[PDB]
Amino acid sequence: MKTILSNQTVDIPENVDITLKGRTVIVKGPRGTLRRDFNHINVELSLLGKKKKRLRVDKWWGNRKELATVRTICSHVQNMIKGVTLGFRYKMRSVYAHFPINVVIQENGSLVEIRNFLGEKYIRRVRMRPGVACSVSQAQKDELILEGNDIELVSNSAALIQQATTVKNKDIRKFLDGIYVSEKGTVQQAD
Amino acid sequence: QVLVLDGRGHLLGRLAAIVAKQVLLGRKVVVVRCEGINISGNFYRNKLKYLAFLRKRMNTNPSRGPYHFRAPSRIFWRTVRGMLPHKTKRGQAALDRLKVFDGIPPPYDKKKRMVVPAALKVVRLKPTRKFAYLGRLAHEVGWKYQAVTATLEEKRKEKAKIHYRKKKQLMRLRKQAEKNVEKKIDKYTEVLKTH
Amino acid sequence: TFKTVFAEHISDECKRRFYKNWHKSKKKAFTKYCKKWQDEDGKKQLEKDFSSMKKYCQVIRVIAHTQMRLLPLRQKKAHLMEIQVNGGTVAEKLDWARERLEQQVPVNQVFGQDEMIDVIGVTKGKGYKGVTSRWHTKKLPRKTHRGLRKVACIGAWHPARVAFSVARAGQKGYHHRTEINKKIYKIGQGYLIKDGKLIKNNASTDYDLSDKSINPLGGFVHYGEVTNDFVMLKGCVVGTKKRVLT
Amino acid sequence: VFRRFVEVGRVAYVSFGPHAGKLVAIVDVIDQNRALVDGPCTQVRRQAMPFKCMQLTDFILKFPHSAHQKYVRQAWQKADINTKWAATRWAKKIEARERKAKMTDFDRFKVMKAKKMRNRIIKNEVKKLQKAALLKASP
RNA sequence: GAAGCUACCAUCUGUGGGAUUAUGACUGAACGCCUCUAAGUCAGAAUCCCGCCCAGGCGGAACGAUACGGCAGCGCCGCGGAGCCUCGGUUGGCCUCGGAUAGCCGGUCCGGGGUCCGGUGCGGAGUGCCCUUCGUCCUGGGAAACGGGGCGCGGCCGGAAAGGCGGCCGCCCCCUCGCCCGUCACGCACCGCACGUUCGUGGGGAACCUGGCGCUAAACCAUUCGUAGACGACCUGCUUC
RNA sequence: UAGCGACGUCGCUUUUUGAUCCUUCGAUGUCGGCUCUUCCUAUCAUUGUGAAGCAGAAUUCGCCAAGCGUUGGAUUGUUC
RNA sequence: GCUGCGGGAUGAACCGAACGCCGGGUUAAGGCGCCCGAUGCCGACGCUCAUCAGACCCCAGAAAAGGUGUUGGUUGAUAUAGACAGCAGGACGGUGGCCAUGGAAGUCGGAAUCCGCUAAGGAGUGUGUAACAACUCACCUGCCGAAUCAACUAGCCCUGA
Numbered sequence A: 001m002k003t004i005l006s007n008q009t010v011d012i013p014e015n016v017d018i019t020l021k022g023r024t025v026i027v028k029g030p031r032g033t034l035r036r037d038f039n040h041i042n043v044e045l046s047l048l049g050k051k052k053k054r055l056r057v058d059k060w061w062g063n064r065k066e067l068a069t070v071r072t073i074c075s076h077v078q079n080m081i082k083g084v085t086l087g088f089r090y091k092m093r094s095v096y097a098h099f100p101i102n103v104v105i106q107e108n109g110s111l112v113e114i115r116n117f118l119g120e121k122y123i124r125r126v127r128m129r130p131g132v133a134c135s136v137s138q139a140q141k142d143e144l145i146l147e148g149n150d151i152e153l154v155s156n157s158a159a160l161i162q163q164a165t166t167v168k169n170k171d172i173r174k175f176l177d178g179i180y181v182s183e184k185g186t187v188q189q190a191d
Numbered sequence B: 001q002v003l004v005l006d007g008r009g010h011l012l013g014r015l016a017a018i019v020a021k022q023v024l025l026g027r028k029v030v031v032v033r034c035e036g037i038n039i040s041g042n043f044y045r046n047k048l049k050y051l052a053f054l055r056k057r058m059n060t061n062p063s064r065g066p067y068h069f070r071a072p073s074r075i076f077w078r079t080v081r082g083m084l085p086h087k088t089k090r091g092q093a094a095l096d097r098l099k100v101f102d103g104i105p106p107p108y109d110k111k112k113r114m115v116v117p118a119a120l121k122v123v124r125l126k127p128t129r130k131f132a133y134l135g136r137l138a139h140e141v142g143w144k145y146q147a148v149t150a151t152l153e154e155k156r157k158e159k160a161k162i163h164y165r166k167k168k169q170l171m172r173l174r175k176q177a178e179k180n181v182e183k184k185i186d187k188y189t190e191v192l193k194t195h
Numbered sequence C: 001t002f003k004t005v006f007a008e009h010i011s012d013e014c015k016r017r018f019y020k021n022w023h024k025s026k027k028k029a030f031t032k033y034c035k036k037w038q039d040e041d042g043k044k045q046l047e048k049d050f051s052s053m054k055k056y057c058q059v060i061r062v063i064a065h066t067q068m069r070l071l072p073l074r075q076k077k078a079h080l081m082e083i084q085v086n087g088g089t090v091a092e093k094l095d096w097a098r099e100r101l102e103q104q105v106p107v108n109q110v111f112g113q114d115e116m117i118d119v120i121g122v123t124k125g126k127g128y129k130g131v132t133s134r135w136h137t138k139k140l141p142r143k144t145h146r147g148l149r150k151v152a153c154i155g156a157w158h159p160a161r162v163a164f165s166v167a168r169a170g171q172k173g174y175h176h177r178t179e180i181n182k183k184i185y186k187i188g189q190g191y192l193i194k195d196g197k198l199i200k201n202n203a204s205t206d207y208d209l210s211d212k213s214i215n216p217l218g219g220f221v222h223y224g225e226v227t228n229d230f231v232m233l234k235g236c237v238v239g240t241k242k243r244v245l246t
Numbered sequence D: 001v002f003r004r005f006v007e008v009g010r011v012a013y014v015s016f017g018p019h020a021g022k023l024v025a026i027v028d029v030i031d032q033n034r035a036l037v038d039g040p041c042t043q044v045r046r047q048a049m050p051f052k053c054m055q056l057t058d059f060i061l062k063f064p065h066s067a068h069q070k071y072v073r074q075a076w077q078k079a080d081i082n083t084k085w086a087a088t089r090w091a092k093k094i095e096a097r098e099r100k101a102k103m104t105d106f107d108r109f110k111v112m113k114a115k116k117m118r119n120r121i122i123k124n125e126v127k128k129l130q131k132a133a134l135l136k137a138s139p
Numbered sequence E: 001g002a003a004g005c006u007a008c009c010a011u012c013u014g015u016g017g018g019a020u021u022a023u024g025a026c027u028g029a030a031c032g033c034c035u036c037u038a039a040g041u042c043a044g045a046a047u048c049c050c051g052c053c054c055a056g057g058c059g060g061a062a063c064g065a066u067a068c069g070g071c072a073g074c075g076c077c078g079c080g081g082a083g084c085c086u087c088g089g090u091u092g093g094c095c096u097c098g099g100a101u102a103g104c105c106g107g108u109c110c111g112g113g114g115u116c117c118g119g120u121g122c123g124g125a126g127u128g129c130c131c132u133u134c135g136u137c138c139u140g141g142g143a144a145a146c147g148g149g150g151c152g153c154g155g156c157c158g159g160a161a162a163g164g165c166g167g168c169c170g171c172c173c174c175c176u177c178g179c180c181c182g183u184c185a186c187g188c189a190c191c192g193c194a195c196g197u198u199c200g201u202g203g204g205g206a207a208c209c210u211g212g213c214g215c216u217a218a219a220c221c222a223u224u225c226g227u228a229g230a231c232g233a234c235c236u237g238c239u240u241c
Numbered sequence F: 001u002a003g004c005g006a007c008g009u010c011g012c013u014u015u016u017u018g019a020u021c022c023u024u025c026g027a028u029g030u031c032g033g034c035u036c037u038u039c040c041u042a043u044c045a046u047u048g049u050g051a052a053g054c055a056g057a058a059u060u061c062g063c064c065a066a067g068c069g070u071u072g073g074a075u076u077g078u079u080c
Numbered sequence G: 001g002c003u004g005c006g007g008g009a010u011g012a013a014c015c016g017a018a019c020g021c022c023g024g025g026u027u028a029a030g031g032c033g034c035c036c037g038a039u040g041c042c043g044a045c046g047c048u049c050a051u052c053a054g055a056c057c058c059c060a061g062a063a064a065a066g067g068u069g070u071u072g073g074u075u076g077a078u079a080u081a082g083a084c085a086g087c088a089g090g091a092c093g094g095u096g097g098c099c100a101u102g103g104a105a106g107u108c109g110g111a112a113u114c115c116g117c118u119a120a121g122g123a124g125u126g127u128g129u130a131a132c133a134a135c136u137c138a139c140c141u142g143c144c145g146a147a148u149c150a151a152c153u154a155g156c157c158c159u160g161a
């Protein structure tokens, strides 16, 4: 119905800094930096506040799907702020059948090698994303921890792991086996 | 004489309409950077329509019949063929006058390239509609020369930067010369008569 | 092709390749080109070509030919081959080629034993043969008037043409064909100089250990008396006897 | 980015239409496409004109919402839009385009001879300055 | 039973990259939550396209030889003179990727950020440049220290995607009018009239007289050949060692 | 409502048959078989998937999908 | 048929319009991105994304049915005597009610259907164990905070194809 401006409001804490050269958002913080492009949306991104860091995501007339799109920018900016302050940690417990799933890492935690794989002899290799570090958890059986900054990269790597571990050509109501994403959270707790 | 047209950011049918109108009058028009001509609609749909165009072929003999070009310059040349009366010796002379090039030749590196405002993507499309690249389509279907053309394009872009820095240095020198004095007697007349 | 730079001393077999009638020709090829080699002022305009060759080219192919005097054939014409050097950078490929101009290339230098190397050539000459011998279609029975070795139906009515996939009377053989993935067994030299007065020592393996040559007892049928390097290939190789293969 | 928006009380140029080359002031927006405009001292009557027909400028006024012609005129003459509008480069550009449209043949002859003399003196000075640049770069 | 043809009746070989469909997903609103979707990403196959493999276009390259004999004939540069045919223009503009919810220019600092201008674009194609110059003579005011043209000379390659004009140094015979304003007098003033002015020493073919520098062959037939052949076509030999 | 689905009802195709006679009566050679090429999908199998009353095996129902296969025979002139 | 011409690309019947040979102007039927004459109007208002878009009487393709895909429209219901969502807590006693019997103890069934505590419990919306049990919902309440929900209807597009 050609609705006049819809604006979303983002508060940015003092621990991080933001810089926009247009629709490109570059957020620098304690756990690295992260930059993204919003070139394909055409929504105004303004900031205000002398060391107060109040971001506004403002869209004029548009349509209903574009008024839906203007909140997506605010949500991904919130996700980038959470990833640059705390980071993303995904915990994956290996729900295993009679055959266990032996998981090792090869190249700095960026190459997850899966063996014994529902009894299949084929050793499987999964190459992760540039910017995500994986590890095998201690004091817990067959837990796989994926730590990183970008939620899209971390969760796409976890999706590649949970789709690499897939029961094929059988019933998947029985044979509940695979490496599923158990817990989603942050690296630094109590925040 | 010659009309050297840029191909970046133009739409296929709009640019083909303007070129096919201006080539029947006699102005020798050359469309350069043909790999950058955009096509509105979804890119999956554009390659589906081009796959259907490939599926169209004569069954009794495929050679004697439809000739399906994969290069984007020849794609635009077939697009202007379908709009000119090419079975007659008016559209045949118009296709002889028309030249098309993927990438940029050296004389068109030398000369200045025009941009048609009525055929532009920004002018003719709402900015939330999907589009396509004819070079992306041509590399995805058939035309195996995207990497060589992109390498030569980056080379001539570096050449264009190293020419533009020299031209901008000369323009700063001539505006220093205009900042200097003993020229204003003609300049008052020029300001009173449209500087 | 950017530019082609030949060598200086070009052999008579290459000159027989460049000419058609060697008898009627006055044998005048490459006189001015050898004059360009001899001239010192022509050398600076020749080494400038290699300095341009290092800068503007990526694929370098080296022309080589064969020595026909070491064969029992009768052709006496060499065969020129562009061979793409797939080495490192253009600079050291050009340095390798200029170092090895006017030189011989054995088979042990590039090829080796137990290597899986494809063969390219031209098939046998069977001539203008018929349909059942070309396309191997089924014969018609005995009761058929107007032929037995024919395709009996070509097309339907509504396509009022002949389809290009219909088996018809094509010429059998003398076609360019490539066969892939053939293993080399033995690359062996033969007929070395007179320290040992004449060594045969071919097809003499670790378990044979006898005096034997390349050729069979009585020479090769329709080829001759092989006295050179030879590649011992697996299976069946496209072509007749006495035929050029790459 | 977005230095100018439409507003109750903003002067705006008109490029297309029978009122071309004239300023108006936007009183209020009707519905998304047309806005009621008014000009007290710019020879244009209070009516509704489209946004793509008009052209936004950078000067603002202080109107009440849907005020009368008297209050529009008083806010106009308090803001002094005419002298301040002549004192910008934009009106100089439009006036120069009008002068180039209103040239005659003798004026074009004078412009061409002054153009030759200026471009010759500029070319000689550019040559002298690049000669001095080479003389500086030679040590 | 030789040679030769032939048999899944003997024997050898048959080869991988991309975007994606179905589908499963990620982040994520609409719709506080959810969601594979509305924008954006991931995996994804006998399907598709290409690689490999075949014949290579009224398609283009690089190189060689480029007509003796006794006269001859043929190339490159610069030529002055004449003639037939064909068709078109009446200045060429020597160039930054990119963006349109963004972008141009200038500039201390370590390609980047801060700062300064301009912006329905004037560092602009509603543009810029030699240009609306018919020429000459005489004499004066501005600007001009590069001169300003080249049969020019020696060097550089810029330019590799289909390249030939442009820039620098040193000389050469001159110009101090290579230009803007003022004075003077002339050139056809062809007496009202069209196709006039242009890149034209326009494109190519056949010849005319002359200077300089060079060139001295190759196909096709005939004969032979068999690795090929219906005929043509294709691969081949020929020397006086 | 995994798979089915009456009583009713809306469609698609010309692989059957029927209806009409529009062309063909100074003739379009009228069944079946053999050989051979090409196309469609409403998929029998294979590749990749979704759902079951899918424990495995074996099946059944759907999607993308026509690239490649889709036999040897006794009977009948047979189509069948 | 006996009849040309301009449009419908092509046409016997469609729409205009009927014909001596020509010059100028105007128009119908139609059309104005290029073929192909003419919108190269600084045309106006909105609708539509379709991985099988759509594009003009006869005329050359399609239905019943469906869509939390958007766009209007109608009829209602809620909400500061703080709703819809979201998260969290409670969800009893009479009574293991009554007809049944292998069990029905809100959950296969037939009938019925009330009261107390209440802030609230329906002789109970579903899942489950064969039952008895556990879970959730109606209903009530804790935090948040002001707009929200339901059923029809017809325009485009999609599935049906």
Ligand SMILES: [Mg+2]
Pocket (backbone or CB within 6 Å): A169, A170, A171
């Ligand atoms: Mg099974």
Ligand SMILES: [Mg+2]
Pocket (backbone or CB within 6 Å): C125, C126, C127
């Ligand atoms: Mg033979």
Ligand SMILES: [Mg+2]
Pocket (backbone or CB within 6 Å): C143, C144, C145
């Ligand atoms: Mg018979």
Ligand SMILES: [Mg+2]
Pocket (backbone or CB within 6 Å): E036
């Ligand atoms: Mg999907």
Ligand SMILES: [Mg+2]
Pocket (backbone or CB within 6 Å): F021, F022
């Ligand atoms: Mg009839």
Ligand SMILES: [Mg+2]
Pocket (backbone or CB within 6 Å): F021
């Ligand atoms: Mg009949």
Ligand SMILES: [Mg+2]
Pocket (backbone or CB within 6 Å): none
């Ligand atoms: Mg007949």
Ligand SMILES: [Mg+2]
Pocket (backbone or CB within 6 Å): none
């Ligand atoms: Mg017939």
Ligand SMILES: [Mg+2]
Pocket (backbone or CB within 6 Å): none
């Ligand atoms: Mg007949």
Ligand SMILES: [Mg+2]
Pocket (backbone or CB within 6 Å): F066
């Ligand atoms: Mg098939």
Ligand SMILES: [Mg+2]
Pocket (backbone or CB within 6 Å): G002
């Ligand atoms: Mg009548």
Ligand SMILES: [Mg+2]
Pocket (backbone or CB within 6 Å): none
């Ligand atoms: Mg008609």
Ligand SMILES: [Mg+2]
Pocket (backbone or CB within 6 Å): G008
């Ligand atoms: Mg029609």
Ligand SMILES: [Mg+2]
Pocket (backbone or CB within 6 Å): none
């Ligand atoms: Mg008329």
Ligand SMILES: [Mg+2]
Pocket (backbone or CB within 6 Å): G030
């Ligand atoms: Mg009309």
Ligand SMILES: [Mg+2]
Pocket (backbone or CB within 6 Å): none
């Ligand atoms: Mg027209």
